């Protein structure tokens, strides 16, 4: 099980690791997180106690390198770095673990919440959405805009999600205007799945990554992407049955994990009412409709 050590904690900060969160006081003796589940991507994220503006964090996979956190007093943030000296890293971590200066990642919840939220998410696909090729880990924060947001301004700091636009030539075959607008199956299956994503696993990976960036950083462009990718499936009359069943599971965990007090800003009333009650797939999302109706009957 792997470890992300911290050099120190010079400023008071709430640190979150996946769905978990904990508070660290200013100059508290804290040297990181141990017992992290190999086999998943992970996210380590930060909200400073002084300035709740900018939630920020790092997506990483401990199989790809030895990563640690160090506060930078010039840029004012906790930065992820890679240690290339493996013997140095092990020695620092063993000495740190021996002194119980690290908090422990929980054992595994019964619901398998993180696995279910990240089932299709791969580091290699994150790194093509978040382009910083010199690092093995990816920085995201609350303010980063998406490529599609920028077409409607710094390209290096953008989220390169796949552009989905229902009133676009890519979405609408000349001569099939009514057909393709009212039934998006062409756009889902030929354009996006066969053409761009190659398979449904990559589609679901981007959908899950967008949701997690929306939830953990309040990233508005990521919320737009998550809803667009849901709406494209629900608005298609022809969807592989395995995809519908898997989508229902994906969304159920996302809705189950979403804080109840963030629903107003992170859930789009129009998309969800269309998807659950009006769309072609209105009857195909049984688990998602049930948790939505028990948890957020107001939105509906």
């Amino acid at each position: 099980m792997n470890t992300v050590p911290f050099t120190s904690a010079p400023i008071e900060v709430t640190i979150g690791i996946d769905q978990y969160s904990f508070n660290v006081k200013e100059n508290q003796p804290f040297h990181g997180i141990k017992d992290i589940p190999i086999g998943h991507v992970h996210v380590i994220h930060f909200q400073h106690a002084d300035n709740s503006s900018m939630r920020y964090g790092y997506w990483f996979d401990c199989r790809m390198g030895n990563f640690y956190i160090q506060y930078d007093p010039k840029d004012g943030l906790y930065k992820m770095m890679e240690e290339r000296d493996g013997a140095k890293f092990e020695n620092i971590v063993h000495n740190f673990k021996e002194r119980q200066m690290m908090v422990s990642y929980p054992k595994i919840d019964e619901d398998d919440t993180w696995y279910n939220l990240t089932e299709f998410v791969q580091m290699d696909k994150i790194r093509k959405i978040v382009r910083k090729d010199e690092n093995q880990f990816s920085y995201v924060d609350s303010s980063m805009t998406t490529v599609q947001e920028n077409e409607l301004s710094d390209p290096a700091h953008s989220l390169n999600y796949t552009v989905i636009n229902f009133k676009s030539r890519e979405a609408i075959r000349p001569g099939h205007e009514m057909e393709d607008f009212l039934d998006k199956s062409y756009y889902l299956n030929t354009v996006m799945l066969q053409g761009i994503f190659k398979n449904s696993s990559n589609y679901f990976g981007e959908l899950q990554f967008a949701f997690l960036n929306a939830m953990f950083f309040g990233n508005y462009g990521s919320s737009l992407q998550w809803h667009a990718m849901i709406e494209l499936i629900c608005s298609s009359a022809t969807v592989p049955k395995h995809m519908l069943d898997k989508l229902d599971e994906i969304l159920y965990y996302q809705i189950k994990t979403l804080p109840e007090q963030y629903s107003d800003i992170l859930l789009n009333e129009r998309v969800w009412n269309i998807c659950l009650y009006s769309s072609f797939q209105k009857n195909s999302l049984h688990n998602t409709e049930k948790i939505m109706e028990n948890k957020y009957p107001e939105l509906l």
Binding site: K167, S168, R169, I172, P174, E177, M178, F181
Partner: protein
């Protein structure tokens, strides 16, 4: 954005624009079935596409055969309209193509937008004006060409006749909308007003009677009276 009373003079500037009205595209007669159920029979319809500056009317006649074997006709009518408007635009030389198309109903926006994706520089706009273009089928010569059509057909008219020789397009549009509002509120009375005097005729190449300027003031006053009366007869006032 939306077109309303504030930006109303924009209609008569030198940017080419078209109104599109799709209320009479899908029309039916109702008949009880032998079993006592209700059944509709479609009748010929039309798209009303109007340049408000010049009076040019592109009347696309919708023949009932376009509905044969089709489902959800009110929803198909929206996309058929948009298909025919897009086809019209593509048929016009570039310098005659509109910069804006204003739809009279909010349900035409998405179908027209999707059909006009190839024309990103043509703006598709709603309006908050409640324009009386549905009454176009109360104009006898327009109703006649629609009901006699045996096949899809486009017919070109000038809905202002020769008025623009003597009045501005703002005034001509105001006259047209007054006439059509009257025909819509009480068609029989409006038609009595327009034809009571048998010495005033409709030229073969015109839609409306050949009124002198003075007679148009009398006519327009009689139409206003009709509208106000009906609005009393309606609300009891």
């Amino acid at each position: 954005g939306a077109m309303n009373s504030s930006n109303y003079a924009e209609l008569f500037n030198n940017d080419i624009k078209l109104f599109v009205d799709d209320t009479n595209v899908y029309r039916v007669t109702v008949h009880k079935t032998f079993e006592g159920n209700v059944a509709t029979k479609a009748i010929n319809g039309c798209i009303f596409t109007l340049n408000p500056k010049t009076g040019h009317l592109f009347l696309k006649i919708i023949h009932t055969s376009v509905w044969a074997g089709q489902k959800r006709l009110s929803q198909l009518a929206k996309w058929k309209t948009a298909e025919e408007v897009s086809a019209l635009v593509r048929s016009l030389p570039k310098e005659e193509q509109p910069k804006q198309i204003i739809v009279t109903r909010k349900a035409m926006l998405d179908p027209l937008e999707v059909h006009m994706l190839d024309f990103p520089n043509i703006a598709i706009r709603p309006t908050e004006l409640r324009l009386p273009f549905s009454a176009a089928m109360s104009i006898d010569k327009l109703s006649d060409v629609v009901m006699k059509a045996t096949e899809p057909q486009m017919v070109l008219f000038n809905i202002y006749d020769d008025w623009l020789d003597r009045i501005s397009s703002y005034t001509a549009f105001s006259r047209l909308t007054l006439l059509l509002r009257a025909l819509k509120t009480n068609e029989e009375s409006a038609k009595m007003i327009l034809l009571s005097d048998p010495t005033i005729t409709i030229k073969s190449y015109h839609l409306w009677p050949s009124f002198t300027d003075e007679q148009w003031i009398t006519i327009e006053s009689q139409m206003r009276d009709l509208i106000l009366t009906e609005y009393g007869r309606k609300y009891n006032v």
